[PDB]
Design a protein around this ligand. Structure first.
Ligand SMILES: O=C(O[C@@H]1Cc2c(O)cc(O)cc2O[C@@H]1c1cc(O)c(O)c(O)c1)c1cc(O)c(O)c(O)c1
Ligand SMILES: [Ca+2]
Ligand SMILES: [Ca+2]
Length: 72
């Protein structure tokens, strides 16, 4: 489970299937897969824009918040 930065950190590295400290786009579409996210490929980028509004090519814990910001 992931609540505040206290657990967010662990919940973050736990989602990165590649296991490299960060999460790429090819892993995002699979990160929500465990939930059953069945959408076209044009909708995936719709989630990254929030996880990485800077579009630097990588999502870091610091940006992981802009995606969760306390959601449920
Ligand atoms: O991106 C989705 O989950 C994100 C990852 C995630 C998680 O792994 C564990 C957890 O405790 C909370 C959590 O919130 C995330 C999230 C990100 C968003 O941008 C968002 O709008 C949202 O409602 C939530 C998502 C997609 C969905 O299609 C969906 O229906 C949903 O309810 C959620
Ligand atoms: Ca990664
Ligand atoms: Ca970024």
């Amino acid at each position: 489970m992931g609540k505040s930065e206290e657990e967010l950190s662990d919940l973050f590295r736990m989602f990165d299937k590649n296991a490299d400290g960060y999460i790429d786009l090819d892993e995002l579409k699979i990160m929500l897969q465990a939930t059953g996210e069945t959408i076209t490929e044009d909708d995936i980028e719709e989630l990254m824009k929030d996880g990485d509004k800077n579009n630097d090519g990588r999502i870091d814990y610091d940006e992981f918040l802009e995606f969760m910001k306390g959601v449920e």
